Amino acid sequence: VDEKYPSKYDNIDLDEILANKRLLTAYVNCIMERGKCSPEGKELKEHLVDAIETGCSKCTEAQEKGAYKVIEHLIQNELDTWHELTDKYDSSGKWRKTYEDRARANGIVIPELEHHHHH
């Protein structure tokens, strides 16, 4: 095995997790504390939880960008999973709405918003 830092992910293996339903499901089980975490799962869980709890106040710029890549993919493609995560970690809904606004600003609007726009 050629991986000295198993706890450690970049933008590409994040893209690969986000692209596969069963990998995404496993990593989400890890972040939701209903499944065992890979080392990289633990790293992503710490940063993603901090993103929802405090807007990644404890994160570097790059760690927040990784968390937002995950959050943006969830808002567009897995809204119910996104709402599971915010129900678990967003003490009242501030980062739920802030991240949703930021996604929409980056052109990544929720499906319903696209439907109202095209109806």
Author numbering: 17 to 135
Copy the relevant paper text:
Specific insect behaviors can be stimulated after recognizing chemicals in the external environment through conserved chemosensory proteins (CSPs) in chemoreceptive organs, which are critical components of the olfactory systems. CSPs are present in chemoreceptive organs and can bind a range of aliphatic compounds, esters, and other long-chain compounds to stimulate specific insect behaviors. CSPs consist of 100–115 amino acids with molecular weights of ~13 kDa. To explore its structural basis for ligand-recognizing capability, we solved the 2.3 Å crystal structure of the apoprotein of S. litura CSP8 (SlCSP8).
Therefore, we only worked on the truncated version D18-E128 for the follow-up structural and biochemical studies. The protein was crystallized in the space group of P212121 and each asymmetric unit contains a single molecule. The cloned fragment is completely visible, in addition to the C-terminal 6× His tag (the last histidine residue is missing). The N-terminal residues V17-D26 form a flexible loop, followed by six helices (N27–N122), which form the main body of the structure. The C-terminal tag adds an additional helix (α7) and extends to the solvent. The helices of the main body collapse onto each other and form a small central channel. α6 is parallel to the two planes formed by α2–α3 and α4-α5, respectively, but is perpendicular to α4. Two disulfide bonds are formed between C72 and C75, between C46 and C53, respectively. The overall structure is spherical, with the surface charges of the protein being mainly negative. The closest structural homolog apo-MbCSPA6 (78% sequence identity) could be aligned onto SlCSP8 with an RMSD of 0.96 Å over 100 Cα atoms, suggesting a high structural resemblance. Our results showed that the SlCSP8 protein has the highest and lowest affinities to rhodojaponin III and avermectin, respectively, while it displays moderate affinities to 12-bromododecanol and bombykol, with the former being a better binder than the latter.
